[PDB]
Design a protein around this nucleic acid. Structure first.
Ligand SMILES: [Mg+2]
Ligand SMILES: [Mg+2]
Ligand SMILES: [Mg+2]
Ligand SMILES: [Mg+2]
Ligand SMILES: [Mg+2]
Ligand SMILES: [Mg+2]
Ligand SMILES: [Mg+2]
Ligand SMILES: [Mg+2]
Ligand SMILES: [Mg+2]
Ligand SMILES: [Mg+2]
Ligand SMILES: [Mg+2]
Ligand SMILES: [Mg+2]
Ligand SMILES: [Mg+2]
Ligand SMILES: [Mg+2]
Ligand SMILES: [Mg+2]
Ligand SMILES: [Mg+2]
Ligand SMILES: [Mg+2]
Ligand SMILES: [Mg+2]
Ligand SMILES: [Mg+2]
Ligand SMILES: [Mg+2]
Ligand SMILES: [Mg+2]
Ligand SMILES: [Mg+2]
Ligand SMILES: [Mg+2]
Ligand SMILES: [Mg+2]
Ligand SMILES: [Mg+2]
Ligand SMILES: [Mg+2]
Ligand SMILES: [Mg+2]
Ligand SMILES: [Mg+2]
Ligand SMILES: [Mg+2]
Ligand SMILES: [Mg+2]
Ligand SMILES: [Mg+2]
Ligand SMILES: [Zn+2]
Lengths: 56, 336, 138
RNA sequence: GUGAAGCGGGGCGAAAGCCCCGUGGAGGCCCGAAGGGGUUCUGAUGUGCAAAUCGUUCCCAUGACCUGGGGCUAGGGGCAAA
RNA sequence: CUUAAGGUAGCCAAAUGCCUUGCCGGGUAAGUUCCGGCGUGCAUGAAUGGAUCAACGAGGUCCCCACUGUCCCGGCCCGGG
RNA sequence: ACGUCGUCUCUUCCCAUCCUGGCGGUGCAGCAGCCGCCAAGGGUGGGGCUGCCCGCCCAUUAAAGGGGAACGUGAGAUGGGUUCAGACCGUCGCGAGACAGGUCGGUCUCUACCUGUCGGGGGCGCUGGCCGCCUGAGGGGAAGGUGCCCUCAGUACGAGAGGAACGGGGCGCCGCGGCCUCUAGUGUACCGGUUGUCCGGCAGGGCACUGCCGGGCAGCCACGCCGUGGGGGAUAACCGCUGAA
RNA sequence: GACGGGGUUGAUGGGGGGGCGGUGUAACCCCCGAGGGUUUCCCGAGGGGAGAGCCGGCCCCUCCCAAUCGCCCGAGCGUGC
């Protein structure tokens, strides 16, 4: 019952949602959805360059 | 026999896998329970949907004790039941069969009941109770014929469902019969039947899936190196030896889904009174909204998202009793 | 008597299987290994099923790239990182960037003297010696 | 696309000679359409579209090359890179 | 003795070695296949062509990397049946 | 004219039992081991080598048992071998040829009539018609099977080394039955980006068989989640009480 | 085929409104824009603000439209033991 924020979009993650992703250097990231997870990791997008992140 | 040993594909305990004769579950077994007072041994509700709740583990020996754990839950829209009749049972002396020896009805059955029952304009309860009392010495079971009130559910249909629910909780058949008589024409809420935190059994008809192949119905393997096989790959190679012929244990395509299934030991997490507290802001998908009482169950339940589910006291409960306190549900995913 | 891990092993989706090539996360000398077995009660499988292991599981490896003395020898390793996402018993979903194992003795004692990178808690909780060397635990 | 013989310039040079670049346009040369062939899926078909086909994947594709018309060789005989 | 002579140069468990999964090395965690050796070679050998692989191969085979629904272990979807 | 090996797929049966249950013996101290008896409910796996069967081997495992079913199952598959026509080698033959010696290549036809099995429907009968709710003769079931850790306990046993058990707590793997909240997959509903060309340009659009690329609701789905037990009786091998002949 | 719900004393499907959601910020308007020319009111890939725009085989509300008109089956009696 501790609420985290998405590492990409900044949204709050209610409990039981999203994944916690561990980078190879030991840094832990949390993503609310597969949309944010592929944007941050698989495609390397910039959250400041996406309108839906800025207008969130 | 086989070249390499392995268990048979799918169960033969559910043979034949035919469509259920009734959309309503027909419970065969009811437990003998000692609750210190008369009470209905079961309840019927409608499956609304699934959520997940943050539940504090209350098992002292569990490795997650104290911690908060996310669990999938099932929501049951549970409007109160209407008691219409009281039926007495006795044992046939010739074979020991349980046989109904008469019944008494509420004098004014509701108008919805006329959609399924050819009832008289006015029943006479006092004679029927009078005639019933002559069988009090030979009575061995008492059940109430309840009718669901689907107008108070999210489905909004009008035709109700009728099923017998036995009265239990005390060994006295005489005391049981008096309590059943006192419920004629009244209603029973889920809180009257169950207390939150306890275990129940669930019986329902599962979701229909129509005609299905042997790969899905029985979990038989697709033919390996699938492209190599002429005449298809979603099949078993042979359909039997030369002798015996086509057996009844050979997997075949047919009906899958719409069957009656029973599941044991589901824990009651919450029995709420107002459905607005649990319904999502978007509504339950393909169901609607819950406006009356509801029951929160831990885990999954058989059936589709509007099926009538029967909850009963467990027949195979675990050795260690679950905790006496009501389970602590921190948060439900339908809430904000 | 050696320090006790936890008596439980919750279900984890296996990430590495037979003939997988997994990098090593320690300084024992081995660099890359081939998975050739799984040890324990969870290793038994059914017809046509290839056995797998998840984080915290013990597997049998053969050193493929590393020190010349270590190459082609058979060891035991513990899975500490897993790319395959998996759900912890409290409903939390976890995924790592890379697969990795730590070479240990059959009793669970690490071969090398230091573990690189983050370690799953299920590896640390089941093997206290691995816990003593893991700098980061997730 | 490659770039044989032949032909120009440059550099190094004791002469001899060596190296670099360019020009040139040979070949039962290469990749690859048309065209010819007929390898795989042992694909589809297999009371077929068809008494030998279709898809796919393929081989050759300047030559012992592919192809029209006319002509010759006939049965114990013809013709045969067999 | 010999039917005249008695297998030279080479090459080999060969598309040729029965015994035989030959013996020794290499390769795999594990190799009846494969490669390099060994050779009183059942039954190798010189235009009956021996040895020999640069170029070429819809030839037969073994291995490495890449790749992948081949498979673990099946699911969903599209057109025509 | 009954399709010739092996393998794949799938079902069942035997027990002369490999493990799991019970019991005994031992040259059984413990840990282990060996031997016999009852017992077929469940399990008996993953790989390397060879066309194989078989056999050997590798890492695990509670163990990785063996057999029958037209050497189960090619109107289900596959086609590696064998065992047609082409060809090479060695050997044999004057020769054409031959070899169960080796080697390379080499068409697997059929719209299911009957029965069976699996599921789905219509009618008649049930002693006048109907509606609702029940009972339970019988039938099906493996609906469960099996491991590990802590404690017991470094205790019993033992010269030591080594090293248990019952009972208690926790969890898995395999199977079965469900479910879609989470995560994953898909998602030719939908939204966006972009290539070539055509519609005079922008906008909007056709086509490239969704043109291609990214995301993605619902639904479905597993790689996800839930449930999946103890007891009673008569008994087997046998262990005992009383107890005569 | 069947099964289930509704059938005007009605929210069963559609329309309209609202909720929740997917994508990703439309048109218009304002600012910037490498550089060039009608020198600076022009062209110009593109970037920012406000507005998102589009869409939903989901939920709620609302009788605006359609669940109508109709067509059939159906026991009834005698006999003996
Ligand atoms: Mg299943
Ligand atoms: Mg075929
Ligand atoms: Mg050429
Ligand atoms: Mg062929
Ligand atoms: Mg074919
Ligand atoms: Mg055909
Ligand atoms: Mg060419
Ligand atoms: Mg010699
Ligand atoms: Mg040679
Ligand atoms: Mg060879
Ligand atoms: Mg030789
Ligand atoms: Mg010779
Ligand atoms: Mg010769
Ligand atoms: Mg010769
Ligand atoms: Mg020669
Ligand atoms: Mg025949
Ligand atoms: Mg026996
Ligand atoms: Mg036969
Ligand atoms: Mg046979
Ligand atoms: Mg056949
Ligand atoms: Mg047959
Ligand atoms: Mg063959
Ligand atoms: Mg032959
Ligand atoms: Mg000769
Ligand atoms: Mg052949
Ligand atoms: Mg057929
Ligand atoms: Mg038919
Ligand atoms: Mg897509
Ligand atoms: Mg345009
Ligand atoms: Mg056009
Ligand atoms: Mg198109
Ligand atoms: Zn996010």
């Amino acid at each position: 019952m501790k609420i985290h924020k998405c590492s990409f979009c900044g949204a709050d993650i209610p409990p039981g949602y999203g994944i916690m992703y561990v980078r190879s250097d030991g840094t832990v990231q949390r993503f609310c959805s597969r949309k944010c997870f592929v944007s941050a990791v698989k495609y390397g997008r910039n959250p400041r360059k996406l309108a839906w992140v800025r207008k969130k | 026999g086989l070249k390499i040993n392995r268990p048979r594909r799918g169960s033969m305990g559910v043979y034949p896998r035919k469509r259920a004769a009734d959309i309503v579950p027909r419970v065969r077994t009811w437990p003998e329970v000692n609750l210190g007072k008369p009470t209905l041994l079961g309840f019927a509700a409608y499956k609304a949907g699934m959520l997940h709740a943050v539940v504090v583990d209350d098992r002292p020996t569990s490795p997650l004790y104290g911690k908060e754990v996310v669990k999938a839950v099932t929501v049951l829209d549970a409007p109160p039941l209407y008691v219409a009749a009281v039926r007495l049972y006795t044992l046939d002396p010739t074979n020991g069969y349980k046989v109904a020896v008469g019944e008494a009805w509420v004098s004014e059955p509701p108008a919805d009941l006329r959609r399924v029952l050819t009832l008289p304009e006015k029943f006479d309860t006092e004679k029927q109770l009078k005639a019933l009392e002559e069988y009090r010495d030979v009575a061995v079971d008492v059940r109430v014929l309840v009718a669901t009130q689907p107008r108070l559910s999210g489905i909004g249909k009008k035709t109700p469902e009728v099923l017998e629910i036995p009265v239990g909780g005390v060994p006295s058949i005489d005391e049981r019969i008096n309590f059943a008589i006192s419920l004629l024409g009244k209603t029973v809420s889920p809180k009257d039947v169950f207390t939150p935190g306890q275990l129940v059994d669930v019986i329902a008809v599962t979701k229909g899936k129509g005609y299905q192949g042997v790969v899905k119905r029985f979990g038989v393997t697709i033919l390996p190196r699938w492209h190599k096989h002429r005449k298809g790959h979603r099949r078993t190679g042979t359909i039997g030896p030369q002798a015996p012929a086509l057996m009844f244990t050979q997997p075949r395509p047919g009906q899958m889904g719409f069957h009656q299934r029973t599941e044991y030991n589901k824990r009651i997490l919450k029995i709420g009174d107002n459905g607005a507290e649990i319904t999502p802001k978007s509504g339950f998908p393909h169901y609607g909204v819950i406006k009356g009482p509801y029951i929160l169950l831990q885990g999954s339940v058989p059936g589709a998202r509007k099926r009538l589910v029967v909850l009963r006291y467990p027949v195979r409960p675990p050795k260690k009793a679950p905790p006496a306190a009501e389970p602590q549900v921190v948060w439900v995913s339908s809430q904000s | 008597k050696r320090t006790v891990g936890v008596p439980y092993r919750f279900h984890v989706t296996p990430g590495i299987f037979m003939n997988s090539l997994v990098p090593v996360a320690d300084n024992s000398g081995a660099k890359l290994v081939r998975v050739i077995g799984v040890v324990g009660h969870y290793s038994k499988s059914v017809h046509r099923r290839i056995p797998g292991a998840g984080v915290g599981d013990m597997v049998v490896v053969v050193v493929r790239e590393g020190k010349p003395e270590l190459r082609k020898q058979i060891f035991r390793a513990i899975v500490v990182r897993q790319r395959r996402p998996y759900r912890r018993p409290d409903g939390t979903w976890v995924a790592f960037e890379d697969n990795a194992v730590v070479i240990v003795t059959p009793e669970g004692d690490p071969k090398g003297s230091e573990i690189h990178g983050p370690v799953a808690m299920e590896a640390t909780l089941r093997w206290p010696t691995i816990a003593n060397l893991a700098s980061i635990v997730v």
